């Protein structure tokens, strides 16, 4: 890891390695990579908390491989949960 981390253009290869079999849509891949790696949460003097995670939205025409990208993100992530449409409730995405 530390050997390959100092190569120039590691970010480009990481982006190119996201969902390789899907063609194009490089901005979606960049957003997915940024969400996967994530930011850094912060706490200022123990009274002001700042979130450190990135949320992504995909609004597009039918037949553009959005669901396959979601499945790839599910597979790659360490902890992943999947839900769809009317199959989820108020307390099914929350505590009951």
């Amino acid at each position: 890891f530390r050997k390959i981390s100092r190569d120039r253009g590691i970010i480009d290869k990481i982006i190119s390695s996201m969902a390789p079999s899907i063609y194009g849509h490089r901005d979606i891949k960049t957003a997915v990579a940024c969400s996967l790696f994530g930011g850094v949460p912060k706490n200022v003097n123990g009274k002001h908390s700042i979130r450190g995670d990135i949320n992504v939205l995909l609004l597009g025409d039918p037949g553009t491989a959005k669901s396959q990208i979601l499945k790839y993100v599910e597979k790659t992530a360490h902890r992943a949960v999947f839900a769809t449409g009317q199959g989820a409730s108020a307390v099914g995405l929350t505590a009951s």
Partner: protein
């Protein structure tokens, strides 16, 4: 005590529509809140830059390196010290009003309750934000709370003025939304009379020179064109930044632009 936060319908306040179509809280629940704050964004550049710098200083670590110093010197106190001060004040003091404070509060209540009548008669619809006796008791409570800070055993006019100003900033501002135009039954003739009066005023008065409200009333009303609602028409023309300016303690009406 209750501290509540909420969003309006449609997300943003949507100042284009009526206040009654923006707040879904009924009058029953809105009368139990002493202070109501309606919060809006103004999108000014200077404020945006100041806020951006303030937020970036928080993230880059420059925040703490400043804050401790002020907390050290004389301008801030820690959370625990303020907690202990709050409990000491609440368990030690309970102020009382003075005879002059009641006299100053009664007149303010009468004024703020009179204004609502004119607003409701002009808009021919009931106000969404209500003013009641609870609104007088709220100002009394705020005055006594202000007195409590100094451990004073009596509340005086100094605290009454600040309580009145806070109430004006919080609830009277929310009540007085002052819709520029709603295209409703109220001011129905004004829908054309506004343009009529604007044309009559812009043909009488070239881009230079000034007039007076006294003359603009007497002469334009001798022809029986008065509507009793022309007080805000001049301000609306002023909002165009060209039609009208008010100078010399509001006496002088100056034509400034197209």
């Amino acid at each position: 005590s209750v501290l509540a936060a909420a969003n309006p319908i449609y997300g943003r306040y949507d100042d284009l529509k009526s206040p009654g179509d923006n707040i879904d809280f009924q009058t029953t629940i809105l009368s139990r809140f002493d202070m109501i704050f309606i919060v809006k964004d103004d999108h000014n550049e200077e404020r945006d830059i100041s806020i951006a710098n303030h937020v970036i200083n928080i993230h880059t670590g420059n925040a703490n390196a400043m804050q401790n110093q002020q907390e050290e010197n004389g301008s801030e106190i820690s959370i625990e010290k303020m907690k202990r001060y709050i409990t000491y004040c609440r368990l030690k003091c309970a102020p009382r009003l003075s005879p002059q404070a009641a006299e100053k509060l009664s007149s303010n209540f009468v004024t703020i309750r009179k204004q609502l009548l004119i607003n409701e008669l002009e808009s021919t619809e009931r106000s969404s934000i209500p003013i009641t006796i609870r609104q007088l008791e709220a100002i009394i409570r705020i005055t006594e709370s202000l007195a409590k800070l100094e451990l004073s055993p009596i509340a005086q006019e100094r605290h009454v003025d600040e309580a009145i100003r806070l109430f004006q900033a919080s609830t009277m501002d929310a009540a007085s939304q002052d819709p520029i135009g709603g295209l409703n039954q109220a001011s129905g003739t004004s829908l054309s009379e506004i343009r009529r009066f604007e044309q009559e005023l812009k043909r009488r008065l070239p881009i230079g020179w000034s007039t007076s409200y006294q003359t603009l009333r007497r002469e334009f009303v001798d022809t029986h064109r008065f509507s009793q609602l022309a007080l805000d028409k001049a301000l609306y023309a002023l909002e165009k930044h060209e039609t009208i300016q008010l100078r010399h303690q509001g006496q002088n009406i100056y034509r400034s632009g197209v």
